[PDB]
Structures are given as C-alpha cells and as structure tokens.
Ligand binder design. Sequence first.
Ligand code: HEM
Ligand code: HEM
Lengths: 153, 153
Amino acid sequence: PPVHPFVAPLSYLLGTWRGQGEGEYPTIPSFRYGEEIRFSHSGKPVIAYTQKTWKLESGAPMHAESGYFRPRPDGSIEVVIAQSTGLVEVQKGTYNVDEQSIKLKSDLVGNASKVKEISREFELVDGKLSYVVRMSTTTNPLQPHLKAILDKL
Amino acid sequence: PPVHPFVAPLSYLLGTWRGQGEGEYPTIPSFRYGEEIRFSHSGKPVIAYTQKTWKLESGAPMHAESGYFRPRPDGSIEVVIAQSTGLVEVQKGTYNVDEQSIKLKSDLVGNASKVKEISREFELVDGKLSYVVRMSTTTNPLQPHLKAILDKL
Ligand code: HEM
Ligand code: HEM
C-alpha cells in the first residue's frame, strides 16, 4: 500500500538498519552490542518497529523489543513499545522535519521493578540513524543507558 | 538456538498460524476478520509474538500488535503487548500443560481512552489455536470483543 500522509514525513525510517551501540549506567559496567532495527508499514498512520540486539564477540542474542510509531501532521508523535524483558512503555513527543529528529519521553512505564521514566531521542546524521536512550531508576535520575548508530541496509 | 527450558512447555505455539475471527461489542456492529500470528524465539525464556489482521472480503490491513510471552516453570506467565492503535498492555496469569491453555488478565492497560481491563484466553483445540479476548470500558463490564480460531501453517 502507499505510505499514509501521516507517515510520509518519517519515510526516511522505512527499511532495515544495522549497527552497534554502547550501554552504560552508574550501577553497571559499560558494554557494547550489535543492533538491527526494521521499520515497516501497511498503509495506516502507523510505522511498525522491531529491534534485536546481540553480543558483538559471539552474536549471542540479547534484548529485543517491538512496537508502533504514530506520527501526526502537527509534528506530535506517540510510540508504544513492548520489551522482551517484560516492560511496556508509552512515549510521547515530537518530530522535526528539518532536522530529521524525533524526541520522546515516557508518559508510562509498565511492569518495571526499577525504571521510572525513559526518554528516547533519534536523529538522522549523514544518513545514519543515531539514538540515545536515557532512563531514571528508583536510585538514579534520568541519564543515558544506551547510544547507538546504525547504517541503512 | 535450542528452546529455553522455560519456553519448552509452550513449544506447541512456535510457528505461524492463520485463520479468522469475529469481533463484537454491545456498542458496535459485529464484524469478521482474517488473522495471522507468528510465535518465535531466540533461546531466551521469552516467546516473541506478532499479529496482523485484515478484512476478509478485500485483504485490507486492519489491527496489528506485537509483544512477548514470558512463561515460568511454576505455571505462571506474563505477556506484554503493544498495539498498532497506540495501546500497551501487561497481562498476567497461568498456563496449563494438560489443557494446552493460557489464561491472562491485565495488570495494566496504557494509553487507552476507553478500555479499562483486557483478558485473553488461549486454548489449543484439535491442534488449532483458539482465543477469546474480553475487555471492559468506561461504560461496559468485562465481556467478549474478539474470538478467533487459527490453523497452524
Ligand atoms: C529502554 C530500554 C531499556 C531499559 C529501560 C533498560 C533497563 C535496565 C535497567 C533498569 C538495568 C539495571 C540497572 C541497575 O540495576 O541499576 C539494566 C541493565 C542492563 N541492561 Fe538495560 N535496559 C534497556 C535496554 C537494554 C538493551 C537494548 C540492552 C542490550 C543491547 C540492555 C542491556 C543491559 C545489560 C547488559 C545490563 C546489566 C545487566 C542487567 O542488570 O541486566 N538494556 N537495564
Ligand atoms: C485487545 C485488543 C483490542 C482492544 C482493547 C480493542 C478495543 C476497542 C474499543 C475500546 C473499541 C470501541 C468500543 C466502543 O466505542 O464502545 C473497539 C472497536 C472496534 N475494534 Fe477493537 N480492540 C482490540 C482488538 C481489535 C482487533 C484485533 C480488531 C480487528 C481485527 C478490532 C477491530 C475493531 C473494530 C472494527 C471496531 C469498531 C470501530 C472502532 O471503534 O474502531 N479490534 N475496539
């Protein structure tokens, strides 16, 4: 089906992306990971999102998550994600056409033992998809947990 | 990777399923839909779930959702789902090995305008996957919205 007019401003996302990231937090040792993301659609005002990650040295599967991006013509967007670890998140924010960026902060984090808020910020930089994920916990304020850069395949 | 021992009791789910369902609610006219579900895994104690639905007469895409099933050896299970419509849900309940059934009720429904609780009940019947989804709204008590039966492909 054709791309819905609400999805068209984010059409740069559509496809498969692969790259690598670094994870961190004051409470844990830093680590690296490989990541692959697919964004797809079915003609609705919604983009399907799927992630998988792995250990670089072994290819051993790590975290996965999936969900839906719902952009609107006023530049607002909501994103819902379920994670393999048993969390859900509702993200709300805005996208910027000139910057090809998306800025989100959680309205809800469900089924967490420790996490309170999550923010996710994406930007296309020289055609590569970059993001930073920040989180707050019961013992730590909102700060980075993940950063990755992915090439479009 | 091999099936994780926590996933093995639900190994009957793994694969792709296709069939059809009927949707209803006191507030809406009844409708029919086609559905396809995939259950997969990556060696973790987690089963990935993806759904798509369509109009039977046209093949036109309808609802999609995705998430993760997390069974444990005591017979408990939690399921997290994100829906294309912008909802998230945390489901908790139990599975029964002798019946090949799974019974879930929501601990949380996020980003809903109307829905309060959702329950989902699955059973394998003569090798086919059957489910009933019930929901409560601001104006209606917990009752069926969806029922479907799918054949394993
Ligand atoms: C928004 C998504 C994510 C959230 C909310 C999240 C949350 C957390 C939390 C709360 C911790 C424990 C910190 C503590 O104990 O103080 C943690 C640790 C960790 N995370 Fe994440 N995580 C996310 C994504 C990921 C991803 C994508 C990966 C791998 C690619 C990952 C790998 C790890 C690892 C290796 C640890 C240390 C071991 C552990 O406690 O499990 N996380 N994460
Ligand atoms: C647990 C999953 C679902 C939930 C919580 C849900 C929720 C709802 C709600 C709250 C309504 C409005 C009822 C009212 O206004 O009183 C509705 C209507 C409807 N639903 Fe569902 N739904 C789900 C799954 C599905 C699926 C899988 C389909 C299609 C295959 C579907 C198709 C429809 C249709 C055609 C209507 C009537 C038009 C509309 O209001 O959108 N729903 N649903």
